[PDB]
Amino acid sequence: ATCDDGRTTANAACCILFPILDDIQENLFDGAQCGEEVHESLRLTFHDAIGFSPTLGGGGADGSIIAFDTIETNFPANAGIDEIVSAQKPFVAKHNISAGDFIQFAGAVGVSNCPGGVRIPFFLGRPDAVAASPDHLVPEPFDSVDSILARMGDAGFSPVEVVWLLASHSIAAADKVDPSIPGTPFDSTPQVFDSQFFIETQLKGRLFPGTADNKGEAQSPLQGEIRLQSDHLLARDPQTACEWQSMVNNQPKIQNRFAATMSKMALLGQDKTKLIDCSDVIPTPPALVGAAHLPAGFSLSDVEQACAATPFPALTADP
Ligand code: HEM
Ligand SMILES: [Ca+2]
Ligand SMILES: [Ca+2]
Ligand SMILES: [Fe+3]
Ligand SMILES: [Fe+3]
Ligand SMILES: [Fe+3]
Ligand SMILES: [Mn+2]
Ligand code: NA
Ligand code: NA
Ligand code: NA
Ligand code: NA
Ligand code: NA
Ligand SMILES: [Zn+2]
Ligand SMILES: [Zn+2]
Ligand SMILES: [Zn+2]
Known part of the structure; x- marks a missing residue:
């Protein structure tokens, strides 16, 4: 599919991500750097997704840590996460995608800025979160x-x-x-x-x-x-x-296993078959230095x- 500004992606639904990519690269990641906000956004993918337990509840990679920030960011295990949640929130409102999708997207874009890094598979279409994570899951x-x-x-x-x-x-x-x-x-x-x-x-x-x-x-x-x-x-x-x-x-092992396992974590609480593959929107990472x-x-x-x-x-x- 060919998007409006000419960039291409396999599934036309993914075109909406391109303005978001450009916005976060300049205004969250300081010009596509592998810096503070990348590291925080990668941490956020985990503190969002791991709020998932068959016994105890929580909907996994659902954007609950932003939608229900008042509750979640006060869990002791989340100390320091309020900063990145605050920074990401306006981006979610501005662009027209769910918080669950935005967290995983920003994490995958961020990692792609890091030399030696990988493109983490990215799927679009998570619905809004409907419950807060319980505490004690991180x-x-x-x-x-x-x-x-x-x-x-x-x-x-x-x-x-x-x-x-x-x-x-x-x-x-x-x-x-x-x-x-x-x-x-x-x-x-x-x-x-x-x-x-x-x-x-x-x-x-x-x-x-x-x-x-x-x-x-x-x-x-x-x-x-x-x-x-x-x-x-x-x-x-x-x-x-x-x-x-x-x-x-063993850089090829680090690369392969981190991308595959980050995909699994990004999809906790979700069903890949109701989502759309937008993996080819993530930039090509630089080679290891x-x-x-x-x-x-x-x-x-x-x-x-x-x-x-x-x-x-x-x-x-x-x-
Ligand atoms: C498995 C058990 C884990 C433990 C006990 C743990 C613990 C921690 C702690 C204590 C910090 C520092 C927070 C602070 O004081 O600012 C942190 C940072 C971080 N964690 Fe881990 N973590 C775990 C797994 C993970 C996983 C699975 C990810 C994958 C996304 C993740 C990604 C990060 C990143 C990227 C940071 C850096 C944040 C920054 O630079 O601002 N962590 N982790
Ligand atoms: Ca969550
Ligand atoms: Ca390193
Ligand atoms: Fe901080
Ligand atoms: Fe929305
Ligand atoms: Fe050294
Ligand atoms: Mn930090
Ligand atoms: Na640039
Ligand atoms: Na201990
Ligand atoms: Na919504
Ligand atoms: Na605990
Ligand atoms: Na043991
Ligand atoms: Zn910065
Ligand atoms: Zn910071
Ligand atoms: Zn042991």
Whole structure:
């Protein structure tokens, strides 16, 4: 189909997304950057979608976190999410699409700005949310591995799928875990979608980048980086360690599994067959910049290897 300004897409219904793409690229993502608002919007896709439980209710990727913001943004696990919800809301009103669709669309456009990144499949037509998520459906960084895996499993994800989704922490930072050092990233390359997150979480912790007493925070190996205790555990627990290590220096795997699993998460509470495939509207991401490495001055001996079956790969360090 050929849209009005000449751009093309497989299904004509998708044409409406083009003005939205252009608006959010300039006015949410600061000129198509892989920056703060991209990272926040990607977090939002998760805090919206994971509000889904067959037992407990919540309609998944339904835009409930915007429609029912008054309730949802006050859940403790949602601390800091009000900022991005506030920024996205006017865009939803202005453009003529549901909040559920807008959240997933902004997340997929955002990720496509990141070098090494992917186009997450995107489907258009979610109806408006009809209920707020219950509380206690979002995992917290002080939760156990068993807790996190049981919650994610309740929403439909296997343990390996949890690891794959947490490639998102390759382009991510924390503002609320330690409020003394807001905007401290989880890896040394928060503007590149790469395997550094899986490498650097495996390193022995050395220091706290800010204060020492934050709930859900573990020691970091680098002053410029913060480490969640959930990530410290998932990297090391026998249930997940081998999958975690398998992501290291495996960019095609990170790419493939993150796109596929983000699609599944974007469709929680939804039926793909009542939606329209608009995947080809998402921009082509740039190729990876840089190659997997240990931080300068580190060696293999700084890695806390946790996969019994398979030795950690021989990376070189920045010089
Ligand atoms: C599986 C259990 C998870 C836990 C315990 C967890 C925990 C956290 C925490 C504590 C923060 C920092 C919030 C702040 O203090 O500002 C955060 C940030 C973030 N999370 Fe995770 N998360 C999980 C999974 C996910 C998943 C599945 C996604 C996929 C979209 C996601 C995407 C992000 C992103 C992109 C940020 C960066 C936000 C920013 O830079 O503003 N997280 N996460
Ligand atoms: Ca929701
Ligand atoms: Ca990164
Ligand atoms: Fe509407
Ligand atoms: Fe913030
Ligand atoms: Fe480096
Ligand atoms: Mn942030
Ligand atoms: Na531009
Ligand atoms: Na509506
Ligand atoms: Na909880
Ligand atoms: Na804990
Ligand atoms: Na366990
Ligand atoms: Zn900005
Ligand atoms: Zn912000
Ligand atoms: Zn365990």
